[PDB]
Each structure stands twice: as structure tokens, then as C-alpha cells.
Symmetry: C3
Subunit: 105 residues, 3 copies
């Protein structure tokens, strides 16, 4: 059952292509910067004038210990870009999932 | 109108296929454990069984109250196709008065 | 600023759903035009809920409005005048960190 959590983090960022998204996910998990990553296609509307672009939403599961390192490494992979960077803190998790995630880093 | 909230919860998990996701969503709602469930197709990448895997999955977001969360999670665990399901819980910090009321009422 | 994470308390994500892609695109455009959000993202989903006593499953568009707490009230009030549903979903999350560069872009856009 559930345990209240303060040290888990979800890092949400965007990249332009699926190819990049698949590569970033794999190398992030390979490097121990995230335990898992999801990729979701989205359409974004934003001011840059108003642009409408199709991109990939990435959600990286990680801990507060690995977060700063993860965010920097991601930016090193597209240093020209000014990507979305938003982090959420879950208030709870299962014991088992929390332990797997921490063990994977 | 907007109101600060502390008793709403979004439980996030993933399942393999669309059928699995539809069945689990319907049954949670029918059990009165979630007010609504959203399902989004995703690709995931993770370490499992000593390897890095890339797979297509369905992201699920169960909208519920703190009162039903422990029950929903115990139920999920008995019903989930994965041995170790993803289980992450987010807390909204605000809602409309009318939406907050709708969620709570759906589970009353 | 691109490489540095900072704690944020002033950023907000407002989540709602609408029925059609046309609706979503029209709302997202108008929110950015009016300075109420810096960025709006749209994602196709399926949602399951009880309606008129029966379990319904419907295709919808999930929207995520990225904004500040200074604009959040105005956004929500504006949404209620412009949303196609009688009782729209409205859940707001607080990101607790961002990059210096993204937070500044977001603030400067509003």
C-alpha cells in the first residue's frame, strides 16, 4: 500500500522529434539519470508571434538526488534549444515502486 | 471560481494494452473508487530484468479523493496486469468549486 | 540559465478537457492571444466516467495551460466564459522547479 513521498520527481520536458525522444530516453535510463521515461505526442501553441508545433512530451521518473544532473545532461543534448522544463513532486507512491525507482539509479 | 484544494488526488499508472486500460478504468469507476479515468497512448523506456526496454503502453490517470485513495490502490494491486505497477500520486493545488464538488459527489 | 534548475512557487499548470480538436485548438490559440497562458499543449485521450448513471467512454482532448499564479484566476474565469462544457474539468498543478531560462521565458511571455 501507499507511502507518503517527498524525494521522487517527475521531470517534464519537450523535444521536437520522436527520434530524439527515443534516443534521450534510452541514454538517460542507461546512464542511471532516470528509472523510466514516457513519451507522448502533443500539439503546442505558444508565443515565440504565435506558433503551432507538434512535439514530444517526455516525462522522466527520478529522485531529487539525480534531478539536477538529469536536467543538465538533457540540455547538453540540444544546447541550441530552450526546452520546456517543469518538475512535479508526487505526494505518494507504493513502497514497491518507490524502491524499484531508487534501486534503478 | 477557483478554490485551493488539498483532498483531491491523481493516481498515475500504466498498462500494456488499450483493452486492459478500458477494463480497469470502467471497473474502478463502477466500484466507486475513481470519479474519472483518462487513458493516453505512450511509449516507455525503463530498466527491467537486467536490460533497457522500449515498449508501447497506456498511461492512466485516476481522479479520486484522499478518502478513496487507499482503497483504489489496494484494488488496483489485486486487479493490475503487471506484477510491479507504476504507482505515482499527484495532488492538485486548486480546482473550480464546481469541479471539486463534482469529483467528491461522484464518490459520495 | 539553460543548464540550471531553480525552485519555483509562482508557476501553474491548468488541466481541462474538451470534446474536439477544433475546440482545443481554438481555445489554446485564444488563451495565448489574450496573454492568459504562455503555452498550451493538447493531447488526444479517452476518458471514462459515469454520466446519467451509466459508465461512458469518450474521446476527448486533454489540455495543459502553462501560466503564472498572477494570471491563473483570469485564465479560469475566462475559461468558464469560453469553455464548451457546462461544468469543465479544472485541475491545477504546481511545478516546484524549472530551468532559469524556461521560467523567465514563461514570465516574460505574460
Amino acid at each position: 500500500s501507499l507511502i507518503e513521498t517527498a524525494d521522487l520527481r517527475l521531470l517534464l520536458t519537450t523535444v521536437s522529434t520522436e527520434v530524439e525522444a527515443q534516443q534521450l530516453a534510452q541514454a538517460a535510463v542507461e546512464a542511471g539519470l532516470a528509472a523510466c521515461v514516457s513519451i507522448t505526442p502533443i500539439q503546442s501553441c505558444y508565443r515565440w508571434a504565435i506558433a503551432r508545433e507538434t512535439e514530444q512530451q517526455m516525462s522522466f521518473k527520478t529522485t531529487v538526488e539525480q534531478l539536477d544532473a538529469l536536467q543538465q545532461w538533457l540540455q547538453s543534448q540540444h544546447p541550441y534549444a530552450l526546452p520546456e522544463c517543469l518538475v512535479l513532486t508526487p505526494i505518494a507512491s507504493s513502497v514497491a515502486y518507490r524502491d524499484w525507482l531508487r534501486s534503478s539509479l
